[PDB]
Structure 1
Amino acid sequence: MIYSSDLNKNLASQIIEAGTPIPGDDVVSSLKACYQCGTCTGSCPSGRRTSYRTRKVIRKALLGMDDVLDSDDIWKCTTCYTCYERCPRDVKVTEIIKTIRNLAAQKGNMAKAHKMTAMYVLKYGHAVPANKNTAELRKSIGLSEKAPIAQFSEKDLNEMNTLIKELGFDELI
């Protein structure tokens, strides 16, 4: 039983707001063109082995069911862009899902594993940083012991941190 009291009339507008200016007002606004045909759901590789239905994410955004932000299903999207490519109403589906994930992240719905990966990029500058075995491996192949990356350039590490602090990505985590 869904009552008007259980719905947020501004959900779509709030999703568009979050998607402005990146990926864009026009891009996220495309959710309003959806005519619930299901082409996205039938194209979804994740939907073939789970309860995830791409079309229902857009339906819930239009209807105002904010529980979609607390959903585990929105995080089952692999961003394969098959829905995006086949949508007959030009809905930028994959981008709307990512924008919805941003609001889910703001509300605290981030899996610990994802927060760990984000922490590695902040601390070490890389999601998959170099290990002790890495240096040994690279030398044997005939490459530099350490790659020319941010993990070893103190300048770049502090640059990323000031940006992460300015964006509040640290507080998001």
Structure 2
Amino acid sequence: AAKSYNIPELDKKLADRRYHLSDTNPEFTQKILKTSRTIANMCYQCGTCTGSCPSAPRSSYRIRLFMRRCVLGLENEALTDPDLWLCTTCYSCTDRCPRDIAPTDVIMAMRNLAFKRDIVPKNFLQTVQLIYNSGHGVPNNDVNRAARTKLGLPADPPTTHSYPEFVKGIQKIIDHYELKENADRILKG
């Protein structure tokens, strides 16, 4: 932690673990507050959220730690953490927080910022592709069409699987935010 040596393994081993005031990103905090629509700066680290999380007992995921990073503005610590995608959004933390914070909403805002900086698992991008193509995250297939027919339902549900003219409107909605143009670019690699 003396300085930068430019030997990557030694830089990884002797990374400065010490928090400085140069590490705080108030812009990151303000973006999180705006997007999450929650009073996240009011956490006093009681640990109820982590005590209620179902992901915590089997991983290194700590929602209280993510709340602390949000409060201190530790962008590039929160966003690059691979345990940002282990939240099931079960809302137990939000159900129990004594300060009326929505830590899962803070997690959602963090995930949006991570996507905007191009950190995102591939299942999310594949779901974007599927919804762009057919409007359905879990689309129909031939075997289910046969099963529906044997039941007595129409071979396709009344959705955009049977009314393909609304797919164009869905595609314009997605294209307005450029979600497809980012998902395909990130997938290409």
TM-score with structure 1 setting the length: 0.90
Letter in 1 for 2:50: T
Contact 2:114 2:120 in 1 (8 A): yes
- 1:112 matched to 2:129? The reply is no
Matches within 5 A, 1:53-64: 53-64=62-73
SS at match of 1:68: coil
**Percent of paired sites with the same residue:** 35
Q: Distance in 2 between matches of 1:79 and 1:113?
A: 17
2:91 alignment counterpart: 81
For residues 105-150 of structure 1, what are the alpha-carbon distances to aligned partners after superposition, in whole Å with 9 as ceiling and x for unaligned?
Answer: 1111111121101110111111110111111111111211111011
Contact 2:32 2:110 in 1 (8 A): yes
- 1:10 matched to 2:20? The reply is no
- 1:121 matched to 2:138? The reply is no
Paired positions, count: 165
1:43 alignment counterpart: 52
SS at match of 1:79: coil
Letter in 2 for 1:77: C
TM-score with structure 2 setting the length: 0.83
Question: 1:7: how far off?
Answer: 3.1
1:139 alignment counterpart: 149
Choose from 99, 105, 110 the match for 1:100: 110
For residues 1-34 of structure 1, what are the alpha-carbon distances to aligned partners after superposition, in whole Å with 9 as ceiling and x for unaligned?
Answer: 22233332322112123x1xxx6xxx33x10111
Contact 2:128 2:180 in 1 (8 A): no
SS at match of 1:65: coil
Q: Distance in 2 between matches of 1:4 and 1:107?
A: 23
Choose from 73, 80, 88 the match for 1:70: 80
Letter in 2 for 1:91: I
Q: Distance in 1 between matches of 2:182 and 2:97?
A: 32
Q: Distance in 2 between matches of 1:82 and 1:116?
A: 28
Question: 1:50: how far off?
Answer: 0.5
Greater fraction of residues in helix: 1
Which protein is bigger by CA-based radius of gyration? 2
- 1:152 matched to 2:169? The reply is no
Contact 1:40 1:87 in 2 (8 A): yes
Structure 2: which 5+ residue stretches go unaligned? 1-17, 184-189
2:43 alignment counterpart: 34
Letter in 2 for 1:159: G
Contact 1:11 1:62 in 2 (8 A): no
Q: Distance in 2 between matches of 1:16 and 1:172?
A: 24
